[PDB]
Scaffold this active site. Structure first.
Site, PDB file in Angstrom:
ATOM      1  N   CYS A 132       0.824  -1.211   0.000  1.00 57.75           N
ATOM      2  CA  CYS A 132       0.000   0.000   0.000  1.00 57.75           C
ATOM      3  C   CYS A 132       0.855   1.256   0.000  1.00 57.75           C
ATOM      4  O   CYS A 132       1.871   1.317   0.697  1.00 57.75           O
ATOM      5  CB  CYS A 132      -0.938   0.016   1.204  1.00 57.75           C
ATOM      6  SG  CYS A 132      -2.018  -1.423   1.326  1.00 57.75           S
ATOM      7  N   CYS A 134      -3.904  -0.276  -3.119  1.00 60.57           N
ATOM      8  CA  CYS A 134      -4.468   0.219  -1.874  1.00 60.57           C
ATOM      9  C   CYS A 134      -3.813   1.496  -1.388  1.00 60.57           C
ATOM     10  O   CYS A 134      -2.643   1.781  -1.694  1.00 60.57           O
ATOM     11  CB  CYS A 134      -4.414  -0.857  -0.791  1.00 60.57           C
ATOM     12  SG  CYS A 134      -2.785  -1.576  -0.584  1.00 60.57           S
TER      13      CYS A 134
END
Length: 237
Positions: free
Chosen positions: A72, A153
């Site tokens: 992420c 993400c």
């Protein structure tokens, strides 16, 4: 037999060697992955099959062995900015699709098979325009691109080309496959970067970027767009 260039010579060896280099020296410590098994799966996906009947489903098993998932906040998309985007990702220690395991294996290569044979066709391969879109090279990049987008993400970045009339091309892989499959509620930052001392031809307020913004609104993905940057100003920042 086809109109496109043939398979990369020694494809099988190149991908296994790239796999060893990636897993041991590029992004190690992750849990382990067998490179022989990955090579075998990659070959099994297309070898001996009709080279113009590739489907996304042919690649499910390969991708499961090494999904193109980036931590992420480290993921980078690009469109029409291949060279720049990779320079940028390398310098910031970020990852493009070409920096995932499977993207790294396949980057710059060509492959196709022939019915009945267990060997690569090193003489010619389907061209996407002259022969068929449903070929194993084209389909690989599409399905890999889709999974990469679905797994993204937190904050993701995209490098676009401010020297084109349309920095966002709705028919590109970024426009067709990636943006529309972006995991919801991530945040996307776009950078529109232009050449030389050549004045930009597209901006964040242009028609094409407004189309991108519409897609993202639909994905409930927050959008921030920066433009009017030359390559140097973008990279130096």
């Amino acid at each position: 037999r086809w109109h496109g260039a043939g398979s990369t010579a020694d494809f099988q060896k190149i991908i296994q060697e790239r796999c060893d280099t990636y897993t041991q020296t590029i992004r190690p410590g992750s849990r382990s992955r067998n490179c022989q098994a990955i090579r075998q799966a990659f070959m099994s996906a297309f070898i001996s099959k009709d080279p113009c009947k590739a489907t996304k489903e042919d690649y499910n098993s390969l991708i499961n062995l090494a999904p193109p998932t980036v931590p992420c906040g480290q993921q980078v998309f690009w469109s029409k900015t291949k060279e720049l985007a990779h320079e940028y990702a390398k310098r910031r220690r970020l990852m493009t699709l070409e920096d995932t395991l499977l993207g790294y294996l396949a980057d710059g290569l060509r492959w196709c098979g022939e019915p009945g044979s267990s060997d690569l066709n090193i003489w010619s391969c389907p061209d996407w325009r002259k022969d068929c879109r449903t070929n194993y090279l084209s389909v690989f990049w599409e399905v890999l691109s889709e999974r990469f987008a679905e797994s993204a993400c937190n904050t993701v970045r995209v490098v676009l080309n401010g020297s084109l009339e349309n920095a966002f091309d709705s028919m590109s892989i970024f426009g067709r496959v990636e943006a529309p499959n972006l995991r919801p509620q991530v945040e996307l930052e776009a950078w529109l970067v232009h050449d030389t001392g050549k004045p930009p031809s597209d901006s964040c307020s242009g028609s094409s970027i407004r189309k991108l913004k519409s897609i993202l609104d639909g994905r409930n993905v927050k959008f921030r767009c920066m433009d009017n940057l030359s390559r140097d100003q973008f990279l130096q920042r």
